[PDB]
Design a protein around this ligand. Structure first.
Ligand SMILES: NCCCCCC(=O)NO
Ligand SMILES: NCCCCCC(=O)NO
Ligand SMILES: [K+]
Ligand SMILES: [K+]
Ligand code: NA
Ligand code: NA
Ligand SMILES: [Zn+2]
Ligand SMILES: [Zn+2]
Ligand SMILES: [Zn+2]
Ligand SMILES: [Zn+2]
Lengths: 341, 341
């Protein structure tokens, strides 16, 4: 299977992340892509190609235009305003606020942000576009008839909602890929989000859409980021009724339990009639992940990939989270081995 | 006139504030109260007394109980969770989120926060209670028949809404004072917020209440904190229809313009029939204020106090913002001179 990867991920190399009340070096740093790429090559996945560049045609169908315009100039405006650190939102449009959009950079960065633990830095927009492009080229391979491909996206995407960035994410790569598959002729697509964290951005994008089914397995939002979406009761609205399936799970969850949710999610995807599945793959479900509380082991990732591929429909695997140790690479490679075996 | 002031304000002495993507020493620092107290004494206002302590009876009528419980234990829980910095929210319940309240400290601090530029630090709750007490004792003087009093509140209050802290504020002192006056027998009370920033917390508390009229003069939210409330179109809802009057103003506004809005706000208050006015006094409208863009001069504060007192109704002056330079003291004292002259 082909691996799509852009060296332009390195353009996002932020200096800071607000974590535990301190500004620390970010968990979502360029070494992650290095570790993952090396491991997938070691596992025999050496058909690695750069994505073609893409404009905004596909992404404008999943993200708000004002939001994308904001991201394109946010750094420049922040710097022009004279601030000394990276661009970090402080005020947010929370309960019982005006719906109006501010005009200045401080107001707008809050308007367009869901979490202050993500700084915008120089090169962020360009990096996000490259990561989007990897997702689009992966989707194009599936649309053209391949049964599997891996888009090594960085920065990740699944916390970026219609008009918000946060959780280390700016453009929702998986959502763009699903949209691309629809644009290339599919009528029904599923996104299966196996990252430890709820894909609240993805959920937001497709919540009222019946052409995409979204399933997520994740740490319970009562005790895990993103905190404000991901409950089991959220099943969709309007035309999207019945097309969100959330599987929140608790501390210490091992594969024997997590895999039962996976089985159920795949039943619901099959009942929906997905023509392909975009897998939002985070390996922060690993037992040594520094910010997460599930207990998957490295061999479990092989099982996971095999189970998802036994759906019998084409898969695009899109990289999300997984932190701290180079075994993030082994874990990703193991999912691919399960898909390919 | 009596000045009510608690030395327990110093229990809030946070080390960090998120400003311009950096963690810097907070603007809202204990030395502010020292500067103000010294200046008011120098101006002849030396009848300074500590407040009696108060429990939660009055404050529970303006703030949510869950919110107050959260503030009680927030520091302890943050520290117990192992975080190394002060307690700063990251994830917020923004557009299209679940209304559910998380259970852990990370989730709850975001649920109960409107702005990440305010850290909770040890002593914050205790300090906030002392500041509330100064407002209550001031209100009790007005209720008993005095025509003016000054509550030297710190921390300030007007950004604290029904169930959220932010903007250096935790308990809405002015709202508690207004409630106290109602509880002591008033039927109609006004709050007049002359701090540079919109009193979004105060607005939130009284937006659907017809017993309190809220008027605020402030930097336009399109280009000023708090960014997401304070537009002129916001006039109230339900039982509070017609009882909010916002006067947003732009960069460089001097007294010749600001005073026209003051005149109009007082006309509105008189038509409402306020039995007393709680003045949320910030002196961050000063031409040297480091975080604000109005151009009031020190003499203008005398004019301001005299104009507000010419309403002919009792005043409780409640301290809010004003930063950076020891002249914040002169400016506050000048308002009191205008009231007393
Ligand atoms: N900064 C707090 C954690 C943000 C979520 C990161 C992630 O891995 N999402 O999938
Ligand atoms: N940290 C951003 C500014 C918060 C405004 C504080 C204030 O003076 N409110 O009245
Ligand atoms: K997930
Ligand atoms: K104001
Ligand atoms: Na949907
Ligand atoms: Na009202
Ligand atoms: Zn193929
Ligand atoms: Zn994750
Ligand atoms: Zn008196
Ligand atoms: Zn202010």
């Amino acid at each position: 299977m082909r691996v799509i990867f852009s060296e332009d991920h390195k353009l996002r190399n932020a200096k800071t992340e607000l974590y535990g009340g301190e500004l620390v070096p970010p968990f979502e740093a360029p070494f992650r892509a290095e570790w993952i790429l090396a491991a997938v090559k070691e596992a025999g996945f050496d058909d690695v190609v750069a994505p073609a560049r893409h404009g905004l045609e596909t992404v404008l169908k999943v993200h708000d235009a004002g939001y994308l315009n904001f991201l394109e100039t946010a750094w420049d405006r922040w710097k022009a305003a004279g601030y000394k650190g990276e661009a970090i939102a402080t005020s947010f449009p929370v309960r019982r606020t005006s719906p109006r959009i501010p005009t200045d950079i401080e107001g707008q960065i809050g308007y367009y942000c869901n979490a202050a633990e993500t700084a915008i830095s120089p090169g962020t927009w360009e990096a996000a576009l490259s990561s989007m492009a990897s997702a689009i080229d992966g989707a194009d391979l599936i649309a053209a008839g391949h049964k599997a491909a891996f888009s090594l996206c960085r920065p990740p995407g699944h916390h970026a909602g219609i008009d918000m960035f946060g959780g280390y994410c700016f453009i929702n790569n998986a959502a763009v890929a699903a949209q691309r598959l629809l644009d290339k002729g599919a009528k029904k697509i599923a996104i299966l989000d196996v990252d430890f964290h709820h894909g609240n951005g993805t959920q937001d994008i497709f919540y009222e859409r019946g052409d995409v089914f979204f399933a997520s397995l994740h740490g319970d939002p009562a005790e895990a980021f993103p905190h404000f979406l991901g409950y089991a009761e959220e099943t969709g609205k309007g035309a999207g009724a019945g097309t969100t399936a959330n599987y929140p799970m608790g501390r210490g969850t091992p594969y024997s339990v997590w895999g039962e949710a996976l089985t159920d999610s795949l039943k619901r995807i099959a009942a929906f009639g997905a023509e392909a599945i975009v897998v939002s793959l985070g390996v922060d479900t690993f037992e040594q992940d520094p910010i997460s509380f599930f207990k998957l082991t490295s061999p479990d990732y092989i099982t996971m990939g095999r189970t998802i591929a036994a759906s019998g429909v084409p898969l695009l695997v899109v990289m999300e989270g997984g932190y701290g140790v180079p075994e993030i690479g082994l874990n990703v490679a193991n999912v691919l081995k399960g898909v390919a075996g």
